[PDB]
Tab-separated table of C-alpha atoms in Angstrom:
chain	number	residue	atom	x	y	z
A	292	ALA	CA	0.000	0.000	0.000
A	293	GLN	CA	1.082	3.622	-0.670
A	294	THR	CA	1.926	5.780	2.406
A	295	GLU	CA	2.140	9.495	3.238
A	296	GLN	CA	5.326	10.726	5.012
A	297	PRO	CA	7.032	14.039	5.863
A	298	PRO	CA	7.889	15.788	2.510
A	299	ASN	CA	10.420	14.191	0.105
A	300	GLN	CA	11.667	15.312	-3.362
A	301	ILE	CA	10.157	12.147	-4.980
A	302	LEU	CA	6.465	11.218	-5.332
A	303	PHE	CA	4.657	7.908	-5.969
A	304	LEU	CA	1.395	8.208	-7.912
A	305	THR	CA	-1.604	5.875	-8.307
A	306	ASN	CA	-5.123	5.615	-9.912
A	307	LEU	CA	-3.631	6.943	-13.198
A	308	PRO	CA	-5.080	6.138	-16.692
A	309	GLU	CA	-4.455	2.670	-18.202
A	310	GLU	CA	-2.746	4.618	-21.073
A	311	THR	CA	-0.575	7.070	-19.032
A	312	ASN	CA	2.683	8.118	-20.770
A	313	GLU	CA	5.787	9.760	-19.220
A	314	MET	CA	5.253	12.901	-21.362
A	315	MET	CA	1.748	13.473	-19.862
A	316	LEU	CA	3.016	13.606	-16.270
A	317	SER	CA	6.100	15.614	-17.330
A	318	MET	CA	3.812	18.206	-19.005
A	319	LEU	CA	1.540	18.365	-15.899
A	320	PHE	CA	4.325	18.626	-13.271
A	321	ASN	CA	6.759	20.840	-15.319
A	322	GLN	CA	4.274	23.675	-14.574
A	323	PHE	CA	6.030	23.826	-11.141
A	324	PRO	CA	9.560	25.404	-11.139
A	325	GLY	CA	11.107	22.469	-9.144
A	326	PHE	CA	10.072	19.507	-11.362
A	327	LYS	CA	12.893	17.321	-12.792
A	328	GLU	CA	11.694	13.887	-14.021
A	329	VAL	CA	9.072	11.069	-14.190
A	330	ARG	CA	9.369	7.249	-14.194
A	331	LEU	CA	6.304	5.433	-15.576
A	332	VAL	CA	5.571	1.713	-15.082
A	333	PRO	CA	5.232	0.658	-18.792
A	334	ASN	CA	3.539	-2.694	-17.843
A	335	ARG	CA	0.664	-1.150	-15.758
A	336	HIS	CA	0.511	2.667	-16.435
A	337	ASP	CA	-1.971	3.105	-13.497
A	338	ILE	CA	1.015	3.905	-11.190
A	339	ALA	CA	4.141	6.105	-11.679
A	340	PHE	CA	6.859	8.107	-9.856
A	341	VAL	CA	7.861	11.805	-10.212
A	342	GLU	CA	11.074	13.586	-9.035
A	343	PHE	CA	11.830	17.200	-8.018
A	344	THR	CA	14.729	19.456	-6.925
A	345	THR	CA	13.405	19.931	-3.330
A	346	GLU	CA	10.834	18.425	-0.932
A	347	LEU	CA	8.861	21.695	-0.598
A	348	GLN	CA	8.291	21.863	-4.382
A	349	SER	CA	7.152	18.212	-4.680
A	350	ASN	CA	4.885	18.989	-1.671
A	351	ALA	CA	3.476	22.029	-3.533
A	352	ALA	CA	2.884	19.891	-6.663
A	353	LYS	CA	1.255	17.112	-4.549
A	354	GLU	CA	-1.201	19.555	-2.940
A	355	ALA	CA	-1.851	21.162	-6.377
A	356	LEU	CA	-2.588	17.873	-8.269
A	357	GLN	CA	-4.053	15.359	-5.749
A	358	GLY	CA	-7.477	14.574	-7.292
A	359	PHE	CA	-6.656	16.022	-10.772
A	360	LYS	CA	-8.483	14.084	-13.541
A	361	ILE	CA	-5.711	13.120	-15.999
A	362	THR	CA	-8.743	11.765	-17.900
A	363	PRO	CA	-12.402	12.019	-16.616
A	364	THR	CA	-12.291	8.696	-14.667
A	365	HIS	CA	-8.662	8.904	-13.348
A	366	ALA	CA	-8.230	11.321	-10.453
A	367	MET	CA	-4.436	11.325	-9.855
A	368	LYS	CA	-3.562	10.059	-6.368
A	369	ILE	CA	-0.143	11.219	-5.115
A	370	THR	CA	1.982	10.195	-2.095
A	371	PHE	CA	5.621	10.890	-1.131
A	372	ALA	CA	7.954	8.130	-2.324
A	373	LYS	CA	10.704	6.978	0.112
A	374	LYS	CA	14.492	6.724	-0.427
C-alpha cells in the first residue's frame, strides 16, 4: 500500500489512466519550477513516480494535483515516495 510521510523530493502516484505516458506527467508537473523527471511503469501505467529538486516543491505539486483528472475517470492520487 502507498503511504504518506514528511515531505520528500520524490512522489509515488496511483489511480492513473491505463494509457498514461511519461510525457503526460512531465507536461503536468513541469508547470512547477522544481520539477525534474518522471518514471512510468510501462507494464501497468496506473502507477508512476515523479522527481523534483526539493521536498517543498514536490509537496506544492502534490497539494496542487491530488485529485486532478488526468482523464475524466482517473483522479491522480499522489503520495511521497521513500528513499
